[PDB]
Design a protein around this ligand. Structure first.
Ligand SMILES: Cc1cn([C@H]2C[C@H](OP(=O)(O)O)[C@@H](COP(=O)(O)O)O2)c(=O)[nH]c1=O
Ligand SMILES: [Ca+2]
Length: 135
């Protein structure tokens, strides 16, 4: 995989944001994870959704540099959102949320699952420590 620079435009919630990539503004969705919902009324405001948003928001608002890393399969989902592993100063946001028990590993679609085991191992640790979602 290869990392590429991006510019933060607006953090939406725990796992979705707007970034300037390749000169064009677009919304991104974190690969392999799911932070709780805060928008869609069908799900309503789920437990830890606000917490995840705030964590993602802080993490990325103070970053000197942001990079996006696409997996080996499709780069956008059906909603037109870019699918990537996103790093804030070399720290993978997808993994940081799972490690805190603020996201579960989800939507594992081959072949976009390169860092699946890494995330699995951090989710297991968050579970054993009874963190947030696992509390
Ligand atoms: C992470 C991710 C989400 N999705 C889809 C599955 C879900 O579709 P449906 O909306 O049809 O259920 C939705 C979950 O994203 P949200 O957590 O943003 O809702 O996005 C993909 O298509 N591929 C992905 O890699
Ligand atoms: Ca979500």
């Amino acid at each position: 995989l290869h990392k590429e620079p991006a510019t933060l435009i607006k953090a939406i919630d725990g796992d979705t944001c707007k970034l300037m990539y390749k000169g064009q503004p677009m919304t991104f969705r974190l690969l392999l994870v799911d932070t709780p919902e805060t928008k869609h009324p069908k799900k309503g405001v789920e437990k830890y959704g606000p917490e995840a948003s705030a964590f993602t928001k802080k993490m990325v608002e103070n970053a000197k540099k942001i990079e996006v890393e696409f997996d080996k399969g499709q780069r956008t989902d059906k909603y037109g959102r870019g699918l990537a592993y996103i790093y804030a100063d070399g720290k993978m946001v997808n993994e940081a949320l799972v490690r805190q028990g603020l996201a579960k590993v989800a939507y594992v679609y081959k072949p976009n699952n390169t860092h699946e085991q890494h995330l699995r191992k951090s989710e297991a640790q968050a579970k054993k420590e009874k963190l947030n979602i696992w509390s």
